[PDB]
Write a protein that binds this ligand. Structure first.
Ligand SMILES: C[C@@H]1COCCN1c1cc(C2([S@](C)(=N)=O)CC2)nc(-c2cccc3cnccc23)n1
Length: 249
């Protein structure tokens, strides 16, 4: 089972990171009864034991889903402890070692990832995702004053944001989804795009300048998708054909 093989590789990387100096504070979840404000600051807690248990729960079908959770450890330390704090440097040493190991094993990992999910090897899926990424970076992120929507909100700076917005979305998260080939159709892409606008309506109000900017992001997305309709339609058809042939095997 290539997912078993992949999981063994990821666990070996966790073993190597656990072995780096001074990493113990990242080996297990933060104790929120000692660090009493931790969840008032951090939205997505992560540590190496949770990561390892997730590897064992078969939650990571590729190196990117694993690396994203590992990067939370660093991001969380940067937010809570500070970007230059020794703990953040320590967490970064783990991410750096992971990246070394992923590079060393990149061909084996690619083979496993394609055996787990053949669409990662499908030229139509790849072309479709490439077009979506270009719409995001060249059209949507180019909307003036679109910065509030480029990245997830950091709760340290906006403490009530996730009490109001329980289904958050942002353009970076969409780009990560595109890189993982999450979208096979314009419909699922537009579900996430529209969530950015819906969250602005809810948090900022329908008449706010934030929402006017988010509306322009959505509108330029629709305009650009319409311009590429005939190509995107062909790619979506061919992706459906590939998806059926995978489950057929
Ligand atoms: C809540 C507002 C409005 O709704 C849409 C999101 N939005 C954001 C988003 C972000 C981020 S970030 C830096 N990763 O948190 C880039 C994603 N930052 C800020 C922000 C941060 C700090 C002080 C501010 C002071 N005034 C205004 C905004 C501030 N607001």
């Amino acid at each position: 089972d290539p997912m078993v093989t992949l999981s063994s590789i990821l666990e070996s990387i966790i073993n190597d990171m656990r072995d780096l100096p001074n990493t113990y504070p990242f080996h297990t979840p933060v104790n929120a009864k000692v660090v009493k404000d931790y969840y008032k600051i951090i939205t997505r807690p992560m540590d190496l034991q949770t990561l390892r248990e997730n590897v064992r729960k078969r939650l990571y079908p590729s190196r990117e889903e694993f690396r994203e959770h590992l990067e939370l450890i660093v991001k969380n330390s940067a937010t809570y402890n500070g970007p230059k704090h020794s703990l953040t440097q320590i967490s970064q040493s783990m991410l750096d070692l992971c990246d070394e190991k992923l590079k060393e094993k990149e061909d084996k990992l690619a083979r496993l990832e394609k055996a787990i999910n053949p669409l990662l090897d499908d030229d139509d899926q790849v072309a479709f995702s490439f077009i979506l990424d270009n719409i995001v970076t060249q059209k949507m992120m180019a909307v003036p004053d679109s910065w509030p929507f480029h990245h997830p909100v950091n709760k340290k700076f906006v403490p009530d944001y996730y009490k109001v917005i329980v289904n958050p979305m942002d353009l970076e998260t969409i780009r990560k989804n595109i890189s993982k080939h999450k979208y096979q159709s314009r419909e699922s892409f537009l579900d996430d795009v529209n969530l950015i606008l819906a969250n602005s309506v809810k948090y900022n109000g329908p008449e706010s300048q934030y929402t006017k900017t988010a509306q322009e992001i959505v509108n330029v997305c629709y305009q650009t998708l319409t311009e590429y309709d005939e190509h995107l339609t062909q790619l979506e058809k061919d992706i459906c054909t590939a998806k059926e042939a995978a489950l057929e095997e």
